Curated annotation (Swiss-Prot), chains A, B:
Produces nitric oxide (NO) which is a messenger molecule with diverse functions throughout the body. In macrophages, NO mediates tumoricidal and bactericidal actions. Also has nitrosylase activity and mediates cysteine S-nitrosylation of cytoplasmic target proteins such PTGS2/COX2. As component of the iNOS-S100A8/9 transnitrosylase complex involved in the selective inflammatory stimulus-dependent S-nitrosylation of GAPDH implicated in regulation of the GAIT complex activity and probably multiple targets including ANXA5, EZR, MSN and VIM. Homodimer. Interacts with NHERF1. Interacts with GAPDH. Interacts with S100A8 and S100A9 to form the iNOS-S100A8/9 transnitrosylase complex. Interacts with SPSB1, SPSB2 and SPSB4. Interacts with ELOC and CUL5 in the presence of SPSB1 or SPSB2 or SPSB4. Forms a complex with ASL, ASS1 and HSP90AA1; the complex regulates cell-autonomous L-arginine synthesis and citrulline recycling while channeling extracellular L-arginine to nitric oxide synthesis pathway. Induction: By treatment with endotoxins or cytokines. Induced by lipopolysaccharides (LPS) in macrophages (in vitro). Expression in the liver oscillates in a circadian manner with peak levels occurring during the late night. It is found in: Cytoplasm, Cytosol. L-arginine binds at Q181, W290, Y291, E295. Macrophages. Heme b binds at C118, Y409. Polyubiquitinated; mediated by SPSB1, SPSB2 and SPSB4, leading to proteasomal degradation. It comes from Mus musculus (Mouse). This is Nitric oxide synthase, inducible. Changing C135R: In strain: NOD/LtJ. It comes from the Eukaryota. Zn(2+) binds at C28, C33. The chain holds residues 77 to 496 of 1144 of the full protein. (6R)-L-erythro-5,6,7,8-tetrahydrobiopterin binds at S36, R299, I380, W381, F394. The lineage of its organism: Eukaryota, Metazoa, Chordata, Craniata, Vertebrata.
Amino acid sequence: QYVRIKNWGSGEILHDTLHHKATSDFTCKSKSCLGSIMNPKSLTRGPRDKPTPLEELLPHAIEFINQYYGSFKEAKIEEHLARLEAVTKEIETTGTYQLTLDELIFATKMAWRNAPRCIGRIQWSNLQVFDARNCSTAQEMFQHICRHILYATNNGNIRSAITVFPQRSDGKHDFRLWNSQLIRYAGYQMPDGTIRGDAATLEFTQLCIDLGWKPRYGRFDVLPLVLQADGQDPEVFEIPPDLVLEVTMEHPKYEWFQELGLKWYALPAVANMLLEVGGLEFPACPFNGWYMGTEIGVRDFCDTQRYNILEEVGRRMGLETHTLASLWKDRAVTEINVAVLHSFQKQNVTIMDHHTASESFMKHMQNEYRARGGCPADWIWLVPPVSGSITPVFHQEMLNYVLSPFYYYQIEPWKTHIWQ
Amino acid sequence: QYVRIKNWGSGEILHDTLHHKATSDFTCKSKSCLGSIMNPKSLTRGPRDKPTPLEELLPHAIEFINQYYGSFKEAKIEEHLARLEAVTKEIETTGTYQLTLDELIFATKMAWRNAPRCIGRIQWSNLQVFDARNCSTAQEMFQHICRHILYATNNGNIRSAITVFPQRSDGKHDFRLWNSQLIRYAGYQMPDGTIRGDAATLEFTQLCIDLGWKPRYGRFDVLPLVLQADGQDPEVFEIPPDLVLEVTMEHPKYEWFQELGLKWYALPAVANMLLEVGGLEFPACPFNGWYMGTEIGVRDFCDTQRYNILEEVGRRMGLETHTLASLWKDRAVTEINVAVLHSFQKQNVTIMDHHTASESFMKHMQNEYRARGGCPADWIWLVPPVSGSITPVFHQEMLNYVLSPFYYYQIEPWKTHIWQ
Ligand code: HEM
Ligand code: HEM
Ligand SMILES: C[C@H](O)[C@H](O)[C@H]1CNc2nc(N)[nH]c(=O)c2N1
Ligand SMILES: C[C@H](O)[C@H](O)[C@H]1CNc2nc(N)[nH]c(=O)c2N1
Ligand SMILES: [Zn+2]
């Protein structure tokens, strides 16, 4: 029938009918909840040896073409019927099929729409699609990615975009970006026991250096693009510095803040995800939106396993840093966040604070239920890393499910790559 | 086999074998996660008409006696064997069985140990058990509850305790406390459109007044105990004011804070939950621990649906209250929290800040996995309503499951009570 969902802040009740269209088995079990797991098999789509079995491809394909044509106000039935026949003809002829640019565009926005862990989804229809399905060399990959970065940045006025490379064919000719993010800082373990830069990119920076990247041993060293084209080994490309736009941090009160020598790139671009749509799969399709302050201020800067700056931001604020109960950490993190938002605001670079983000998502969630009867949502990811219950999303009960199209995680490439 | 769990902050990995001992079907489905739902059927144990089917009672009973005797270092096998026989003899003779005080004590601590939504579980073995299984009248219920409140309070030096009333027999002679909490404030809808006190207790305060309670139309009016004994209708009892200990709020810097006229009761006591153990069920068994600042500071005070004080605490702090992006809400909530912790600390009343709480739970979680191979945990409840990722629990992946004994929710009594 339907599932009842309540918003404990507003008292409003909603009915979820959309979960009925969910793929196959998800994260949890009959006797336990595992929604707390970061990378479950259910959110991951791995490698392939042989092409996709046609008995599987065709129904998926037909369902996608049905969804696409079922999406315009006053559909084109003769076009719909023609497309179904052509797709079937193509599947039986070539072993697979090609999406029209229009279908791809629709696929990319819908997969974003279906991303349960994204707060920015109110923006789902504003997405620029770069068709790089004709690509064949790593060098061409690199050029496409540069156009992306250039377009996306727009000199601070961030624009959301995605660039789709060739779809998986047999499974041994996959196009992959070995980077987690398009733009990201390096993390080196220093001689003195410490770690500089991004502790999260440790194992990867080591891979980059092993493929011959020149380690600039600093704290904000933008790592290189590590591209895998067709079946080939990955090639290393340096990101043109002119393309990488950053924001240096500074507080509108605490003038000693900038003396911390902190900054962050203005571009949040997921590089290693896979787009599934109508039986097809694209293992290389980097995408970007704009940042939400907490990503940088709370997670990037304050996480133990990342930059870890809390200890000294507390010190430099006076604060009893050795008395947990004093709530210094609460004090600092709040200031590190106004810095980020001020620094981004001042330097004319798009940013979104978590409160306005949460409020926009709530508006989106209502639009979604009204428009299609549901919105797949992952509360654990959707609730900001700070000020939990101060945001509307905390009081909203939600359902998490995998629809199609969708953006999946992939098993990291170095673990499955057959080098030549 | 076992489930792999990772702590993304420390890199530590853990194996969960305990989830194999989980009861029956939990919250989620084959195709979707619903761990975000507040009151799912899986966390609730409802009404009964007829006694418990013996085919069900006996295995459950035997399993509990096996667990109990399997719990002491160097067990008493002849006592274990004797207890199994006696329990079986009693079940076949009287239709049910009675727990020894020692087994009850063990049951109450283990059910607490198994509460996936409790952060304070490191304390699980320090629990005072009040045996009120001999009780028969509402007046005796009221006396027991008063002894509880008195003992628990200890004049600020809060002590954890539970008071167990008679177990469900046929299902139509249930002992129930109609209150959500032992001590709790009233919420009235005022003439001027507003609402005073606790907006959460609206529908209930109306029930109290309908059973003849005298509405003192204030903002901190401690509601009456509404007791249901044997099968009978509920009787209303006023909580002796001398028993109710409160804490008035005041900031160690902002002297205008106390002029807000704010306070909160020093006793967090869940009144409406059901204890299940070895086939048996106790529908009345109120329990208490001590408070965690955020409960009062963030949830009680700042929630829209509760006291809702943010708007004016912001105003009285200067803050641009009409500019979301200014992060005023972050600023205020932090101060409302130091107040609570200071006010509680000054007035010599036990309290625990969320950071130290999170750290103690993490230590408990490790002790648990080491001791029994798991710890049922609900990330959505365990992560504080503020400073999410600043706490260790946010980075800890966890598994949520229902073991036995356990504390269940119950369908609210007014919805199922056959009045006489
Ligand atoms: C327009 C601005 C957007 C904002 C403000 C936004 C914000 C966010 C935030 C805050 C996260 C969590 C990041 C993390 O904790 O790792 C996220 C994740 C995500 N976003 Fe959005 N997003 C936007 C646009 C997009 C776009 C354009 C796409 C795809 C076309 C997208 C796809 C996703 C996906 C798949 C995730 C999950 C990533 C993962 O699982 O690691 N987002 N987004
Ligand atoms: C010793 C101090 C303790 C602390 C600091 C503590 C703290 C907490 C906190 C912060 C919550 C969440 C409250 C909410 O958000 O509604 C909670 C819930 C809970 N606690 Fe503990 N607790 C303690 C002792 C106990 C005891 C003694 C029991 C039982 C014998 C217990 C049983 C539970 C249960 C069942 C819940 C879930 C309540 C619900 O689902 O509404 N706690 N505790
Ligand atoms: C273990 C836990 O799942 C993990 O720390 C989470 C929680 N919620 C999150 N939320 C977001 N948006 N991003 C994250 O990285 C995480 N990680
Ligand atoms: C909808 C959502 O489940 C709800 O707001 C939650 C989340 N986590 C919580 N955590 C605690 N400890 N207490 C709560 O009341 C809640 N409620
Ligand atoms: Zn689940």
